[PDB]
Design a protein around this ligand. Structure first.
Ligand code: HEM
Length: 294
């Protein structure tokens, strides 16, 4: 099938104010549902959801991506690849009901942006206009990366998402958030201590901790530290590859640089496959609840 073009179309009669209200609803629920996942909260899984849905994109034929907001998950979340994502969709359901006018793609991606900012991460410019395509569903089957691979696999995989070395290393820093859950992915443990605060801890831990490759309770190999942290083989490959290593060191020593690069890469990820008209509104930069005194 000929490559389809997806033009961003602003939800009829909606403006910045409307989306800030959605952002606020998401942010308020993040604050309210504080007990989820042993008090980590829904922040991490929402970021994962935004990445996963956008990560289905294929630059070659512009299939997948965040635009359509319509997907079919393998085994309906009963697969090591997508298990756990249902928690994010469940969290967003009440938000969508309160704001039925927002497209699914806009909601899923906005959920990630809101989560990163509320967790004290960098501001992520975000654009509206994704249009639901119920007639065009994108199966996630084999489109997201395996975690038991090396640096060459990671580099090649991300080329499909049009990401270079710096973009890949920056995006991976999101693993400072949340944790792996054995029953979900066959991996267990957090990557750091501040599981729900967005910082460059991922890089510091990679370089500073004493890691040991071991099999977990699912018989899968992962790198463990005495501090109680873990790294997937794909995470660890970032310090095994010399080109990735230099960038990990850069981010480990410059919090501001990491924030700026992550912001650019994350927005790009969430916008891959979308064509924005020259007269489309400028990207929205939402204020956090804190900045609004809410
Ligand atoms: C080589 C690429 C990647 C691989 C192999 C990978 C793999 C995984 C795996 C196995 C989990 C654990 C799922 C679970 O057990 O619940 C996970 C969680 C997560 N990933 Fe990644 N990931 C990759 C890239 C990314 C990127 C680029 C982002 C976002 C910018 C991201 C954000 C997250 C977050 C925030 C979590 C924690 C979710 C939670 O705590 O519920 N991942 N990822």
């Amino acid at each position: 099938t000929t490559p389809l073009v997806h033009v961003a179309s602003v939800e009829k009669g909606r403006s910045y104010e409307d989306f800030q209200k959605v952002y606020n609803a998401i942010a308020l629920k993040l604050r309210e549902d504080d007990e989820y996942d042993n008090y980590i909260g829904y922040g991490p899984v929402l970021v994962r959801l935004a990445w996963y849905t956008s990560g289905t994109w294929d630059k070659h034929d512009n299939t997948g991506g965040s635009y359509g907001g319509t997907y079919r998950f393998k085994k309906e979340f009963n697969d090591p690849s997508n298990a756990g994502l249902q928690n994010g969709f469940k969290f967003l359901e009440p938000i969508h009901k309160e704001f039925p006018w927002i497209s699914s793609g806009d909601l899923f991606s906005l959920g990630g942006v809101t989560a990163v900012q509320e967790m004290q991460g960098p501001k992520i410019p975000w654009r509206c206009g994704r249009v639901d395509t119920p007639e065009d569903t994108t199966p996630d089957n084999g489109r997201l990366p395996d975690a038991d691979k090396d640096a060459d696999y990671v580099r090649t995989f991300f080329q499909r998402l049009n990401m270079n070395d710096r973009e890949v290393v920056a995006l991976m820093g999101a693993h400072a958030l949340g944790k792996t859950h054995l029953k979900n992915s066959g991996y267990e443990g957090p990557w750091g201590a501040a599981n729900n605060v967005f910082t460059n801890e991922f890089y510091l831990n990679l370089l500073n901790e004493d890691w040991k490759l071991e099999k977990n309770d699912a018989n899968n190999e992962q790198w463990d530290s005495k501090s109680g942290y873990m790294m997937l083989p794909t995470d660890y490959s970032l310090i095994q590859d010399p080109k990735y290593l230099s960038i990990v060191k850069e981010y480990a020593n410059d919090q501001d640089k990491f924030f700026k690069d992550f912001s650019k890469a994350f927005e790009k990820l969430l916008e891959n496959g979308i064509t924005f008209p020259k007269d489309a509104p400028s990207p929205f930069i939402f204020k956090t609840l804190e900045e609004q005194g809410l």
